[PDB]
């Protein structure tokens, strides 16, 4: 009769709240996802706001953080461990350093089979071309692009075909990007005016989803600094 618990948060007041939990009954996704980080995304020096971003982690994959980033990882890949601090304190410190070693850590997490969602909600009317191009720009900032140029190019072509729908996207619509355990991407669209979902294409090339979500979580110039900041803090609590 009297619901008393908050299940969503207002990432940006111009669009609808982001749910803390996304299940296969709410969206066309494969498992239960929990909000990890969130924030607004801006572009260019004019700080032009383009969308609100929600990053989600599969509930059943929360164990993968500590299974991957542990005291073994720490001494295997770092040679500057402060022995006065615990392993989790050192791992947290190194993740917050926000340097090339932080990227390595996030990339290793992504290789562990960690399943994720990105919910992208435009704050103005746009179109699928611009959403797609924004993902390409993000992917292209990953530090390892130059060492995987040809394979990545094949993946970016898959990304074009994955955007099966063409045309307008309304403010407050949702693009849903799901990262599968194997690294593939599944795309989906939510028409919020008519409350209709359209499943779109897939990208099976692993580099695409790996580079995209790595840049969301730890990019030097990430699309949403606040989503990066909140997601990293939340990942640290799972150590």
Author numbering: 83 to 321
From the paper:
Saccharomyces cerevisiae possesses two predicted CHI-like proteins, Aim18p (encoded by YHR198C) and Aim46p (YHR199C), but it lacks other enzymes of the flavonoid pathway, suggesting that Aim18p and Aim46p employ the CHI fold for distinct purposes. Here, we demonstrate using proteinase K protection assays, sodium carbonate extractions, and crystallography that Aim18p and Aim46p reside on the mitochondrial inner membrane and adopt CHI folds, but they lack select active site residues and possess an extra fungal-specific loop. Consistent with these differences, Aim18p and Aim46p lack CHI activity and also the fatty acid–binding capabilities of other CHI-like proteins, but instead bind heme.
Full-length constructs of Aim18p and Aim46p possessing N-terminal 8X-His tags were insoluble, but truncating the N-terminal mitochondrial targeting sequence and transmembrane domain for Aim18p and Aim46p (Aim18p-Nd70 and Aim46p-Nd62, respectively) dramatically increased solubility. We also generated point mutations of the CHI catalytic arginine—Aim18p-Nd70-R123A and Aim46p-Nd62-R107A—to serve as experimental controls. Each protein exhibited robust thermal melt temperatures ranging from ∼48 to 67 °C, indicating stably folded protein. This experiment revealed that Aim18p and Aim46p coimmunoprecipitated with bound heme and that mutating the catalytic arginine significantly reduced heme binding. Alignments of the Aim18-Nd70-R123A and Aim46-Nd62-WT structures with the bacterial protein revealed that, while the α-helices differed substantially, the core CHI antiparallel β-sheet was structurally homologous to the core antiparallel β-sheet of cytochrome c'β-Met. Nearly all of the CHI catalytic residues are substituted nonconservatively in Aim18p and Aim46p except for the catalytic arginine, which is invariably conserved in fungal homologs of Aim18p and Aim46p.
